[model samples]
Target: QDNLYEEIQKHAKQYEIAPQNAMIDKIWKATPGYNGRQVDMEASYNNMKKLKKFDQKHLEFKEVSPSVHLEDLSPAPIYRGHPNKKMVGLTINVAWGNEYLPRILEILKKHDVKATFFLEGRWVKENLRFAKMIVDANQEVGNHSYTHPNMKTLSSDEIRDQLQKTNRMIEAATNQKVRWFAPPSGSFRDEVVKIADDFQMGTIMWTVDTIDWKRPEPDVLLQRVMRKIHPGAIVLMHPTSSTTEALDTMITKLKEQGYKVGNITELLDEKRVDLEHHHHH
Candidate 1:
């Protein structure tokens, strides 16, 4: 019997986490699954052999993948990501104005954080400079329809036109392909979701809303977000006074609790985030 491998087995169960399957909830819509992880017996044994001891620092791990993925499910909106994935997405829906954008972009750049901004076609055309600034800052852009209309009231053709026009405008102006759609005022129906799917774009919703447009006090806005914050939460906000004031502290507090704040792509991806173990001795 191998003594080193036997020692490694003793701690294997302590680190193992099972995979969660992706499913469609009646209320939550399409939720993503997270991959499971377990100790890599062979690799851990190999590394620990160098020290001839059972060392936690030498433990290697492997991912136990889930059988289903987010895309495997039927067309639906994604309100949140996998619970086990300790990450969050910051989404800003831009359709009104750009008065507060510079400061918002400044804070994001200062922290080296990237966020997704869903832009209306009309807004993009009028504020091409600001649109370019967003992309130039290495942030992502998504479809917010062409006219910011109530998507539910629009006919199928109207829906198509809205999504198509916005897609063309965003692509033409920013040279960035849109992958997600955030309905104006979070308004949508099944047909809207299907139409976005036809465009090969996922409909995105938020787990928490900052309601910054209401212009609450900066500390109040911060508290509102932190209180509802959780793993895989997609926070909805706008370029408003409250957001510009609270964003810096919001990023810092999210990191203080070991959460990785990123754009929608990073938040929705199934890739694991906490693999680096440094025992700098």
Candidate 2:
């Protein structure tokens, strides 16, 4: 109390050529509690604007919905997109139309996305040059089985041969670990995943299929895709003229709605950037 009075008295004397009202007012109205120090207030701060407050719905608990587990062993194949974030996996199964893949690659690059391609072993082996291009272009390649066969009818040995042989061929093509396996023709049983799991590859299916093999109209395909695409949706597309044309259009629209397009491995792995597949060994 004495110190406050003495400070104010000194301020009056020191204001010889200047007004002391500013100094006196400042001294009397000094404030505190802004140095990150804790303080208690008897009442809440005035919200003079009379606006609503935040935290009315701060991170409400919801259903746990992610079905894709990179580490979980499943009796069934993975088909949906991640249940955690807004992302979509575009799986392009390439059995034919090698000529059109380059256009698809260009569109993916234009949108700066990497999609997964499930390739036939013989197709990749025949077109080794194109296979190398896919690897060098930094895309994800997986085995679509040796040929587009129905795995349900095949024996366990046959399934193993189909997946393992294709794995070796893809290894020859990309030299990176084949992390996913999309059953050809959606033909797989619990045993298919069992075989794929033994080979250290996740068996993948589709949440939504474009069915471009039927040669649907591009505009209708786009409309159908826009309507059904939701968080954690995996879209299956075959390499056809229709898919080739719609690739760019779909990418632009998806990004407009704040969704990311990536391969199956990328969407599930939770990594923002693609791991460098540059390995010679």
Candidate 3:
């Protein structure tokens, strides 16, 4: 117990981390904020005293949240994650191409990567098993609107029907609350964004697009992504032949460049990962 307090004070600066504020960007729109971390001296001292020595594993850390969160800013869609994050989001919007999903899921499993799948309400209703399979595989899910309407043209009530109806079906089917809304065909107005926010789900936009629906050659599709990929990128794709063929190589290249490919939630997380001590899938 002796001099434990002094030791904590001495090491505090090296462990202390500063929080990053969520801000609005002219090009990227409203990016999310992340929490800083600080060592808890009381807990650390107590643990060290109990052990009668110091150990890095016993250090207690607490989150220091940002003053301004994503919700604190104006209702805006997020096009990318925090710029400093070395993570990328794989978002697959599924309205069709059921034949390709099995292979896509298999490829994801082979790579041991998780992606966010945005599903249409009508589609989810028709393909409950596939939707459930995504959840079963531990992938994240988002709403792609019911009937795949252009949310920008719909009335407020129409928009709500598009969002809430899908939310009900997806949540009921997967038993996981949907936290993001990806507008069909990338069509949305300010009202669309606002309505999604009202429902407590933020609209999500893509940082890069595979345009896989066009059935480009697998090499072409992979090249397009590789050329534009960067930290905090949200890659928009669909369950298509091109994506199924390119998924494995795309993940390999991302890892080769030292990026962790994961779902939207991880990409947007504000908490600083102790890269030195953090483990991953």
Candidate 4:
């Protein structure tokens, strides 16, 4: 387990560093859809052999980090946002780029995947049809506040009002209960979490962040996702054309790997029983 935690941490840090140089970007764009194929399998296999040898010699499973535990639940399984097929929630700051909604919808439809689109209240008020199209497609709609402000930075009343306004508009458009709340830019305070709980809404955070917002090469984006994916991942992606270009191949590969892809709700519902007994381990 120590080794496993270290492995994940290493990859997480790798993701933190920007790796794509100009040449990598050029190779990625040259692809038809910007989605590169998997990394060379033989090389991956050789690296795994090296990792195992290193683990055998020095890595101790019993040497656990307090931060890495058997069943520490601060990061809920549903919100881990990795390998979640049931739902990939896209918190759209639609006011920034509303036009991408149609293309995002198209990609979801093409892949037969349903996503949770957390729309800003102001955007919903302005573009009701676009909100309804999300509903019409049998996808989940969520609340992302009136304006995409950082909830952690807001006053209590402002936070409540922001959520309430977005919830009200979303309910009006979908005529369905908005059960999930994703804080703008993954910024939410303790009070905000409590408020969401009071509203009976689950706060969702990503396990695998595409960081497509950076406009990284599609291959690099795909590489990041494939390497980091674990069960119950809630990937955060946007409606960028680069993401669209990579979406099909990414989804196909996820499915091929025996991942049951669905919206966040469905992913949350699938039980990985070991998770419940984690403390016992």
Candidate 5:
């Protein structure tokens, strides 16, 4: 437990400018039976004494200093845009029939918003031109695995094959390198993250999940999205008729709320930015 406390404190001290991390460390240290070891009141009290010295040293490092201005942070969330009103990401899974593809494209084009489309291997094989059209429009494309299976149930070999095939198919269609992935049906386990990292692809999960696959009413979908939308939120939607009907109104509402709807890649800035001086790692 002492070792665990030291480990937690080390990580907490690294992020001295982030109050959330420090608060979390305090809560964890105070918790009873943390990691199956009874909390040592004396040891914990002594640790708190050490924190003042640690914090003082942390303050000496300008990068991790709490006194440092918030503007110094990488991907400055405030100066980049409004804290309340900002861009929202829309990621669409293109499978299970694509009758709404053309109409969806037209709607998105009308709004001049680029959305991320995760193309399944089978879908890409049958509708290569449509995949090309999405790429031609300067939209983002990501891998959705080969057969849309529950990725959590598959072996590492199966996972590699699925992603590799889908990556090839998407590259063929888009003529561009794919750098992001959304798990099929939001199904993934710990291994999935490792595999995606090996592929040099970022795994994206949605903050706002519409579950449009259930074919809910347009108004219900609209309400759910409006209530849940926040800065840096990735919204998951499918290419179904219901979502197609709701797309225009949804985009309009999001824009009116001061959201710049865009693809996940652009919103995340997948292109690495130099933050060598700021990051301790």
Candidate 6:
């Protein structure tokens, strides 16, 4: 047991969670009282080796997992904005982008701005390299469901499938658990939110819609965003041709006004994340 614990300490990994040291104790206490895999559940978890199928195949022995969600569902949900009123959470949803996404990344890189890309699962599979490129740049990748379908209409299984599939794709690419879920078209039922919660993702809504979905010309859309921008404002955008054209100038202007961009988590809670700068831009 000591050697096994040492081996786990030396080799186990965590993405958004602690390595399974404490959980190992539970496995030991359970002992042969548990089945084949839970006997060494901690080792099975950290080593990336499967102990048993976490599926319905084994009705008698179920592998328990830690719950994913933690946030409260308030009356005033996250419609837009952050806890801090100085920085802008620029969340760009990237379901499809070939002509402009890479370019947008370049612009964000030039400005040292980090935006979350809420990705569609199908798109991630179709555009693996581009998706990986976004993750590689240290930008956040959010799950935007598999098909960007109207989630309100989906069955429970459908919604779970959508979120989990996207999550798997993102985890495979980035090796990090997704923390945010941007609903496609802002159309969802209470069930969908629970689905995201089960995946340990917050259902993140935008404060301000860039309205670039209509594919507005760069300057006109830029004007809209500029007028509505504020502290804790989560500006939603797409990687359309025009927004890509306008992004650089907007990023520069936002910073000039002393606004900094980061992932949703950082923007929402300033104190938790270590500081660099902002307006505290």
Candidate topping lDDT: 1
Per-residue lDDT over 86-182 for candidate 3, one digit per residue giving the tens place of the 0 to 100 score = 7788999988888988888888998878899999999999999999888888788999999998788999999998999999999999999889999
Each candidate: what lDDT?
0.89, 0.68, 0.87, 0.61, 0.66, 0.67
Among all windows of ten consecutive residues in candidate 5, which has the lowest summed lDDT?
Answer: 27-36
Ranking the candidates on TM-score from highest down gives 1, 3, 2, 6, 5, 4
Q: In terms of TM-score, how similar is model 2 to the real structure?
A: 0.72
Better of 3 and 4 by lDDT: 3
Number of the predicted model whose TM-score against the real structure is largest: 1
Residue by residue across 81-102, what tens digits does model 5's lDDT show? Answer: 1122246778898875467888
Q: Please write out the lDDT profile of model 6 over residues 13-132, one tens digit for every residue.
A: 321212111111221110001111122324333333253323222112113222221232321225543333356888888888677888888988898888888999899889988888
Better of 1 and 2 by lDDT: 1
Residue 116 of model 2: what lDDT? 92
- Which residue pairs clash within candidate 1? none
Give Cα distance to truth, residue 186, candidate 6, Å.
0.7
Candidate scoring better on lDDT of 1 and 3: 1
Off by over 4 Å in 6: 1-77, 272-281
Candidate 3 deviant stretches above 4 angstroms: 1-17, 35-64, 274-281
Residue 222 in model 3: shift from native, Å?
1.0
Error of 2 at 75 (Å): 4.0
What's model 3's overall lDDT?
Answer: 0.87
List TM-scores for all candidates, in order. 0.90, 0.72, 0.83, 0.65, 0.67, 0.69
Candidate 1's residue-wise lDDT over 1-281, tens digit each? 55877879988898777878989988888998787778888788888888899988778778777888988999999999887788889999998658888888999998878889999999999999999989988899999999989998999999999999999999999999899999999999999999999999999999999999899999999999999999999999998889999999999999888888988988887766663431110
lDDT of 4: 0.61
Candidate 5 deviant stretches above 4 angstroms: 1-85, 270-281
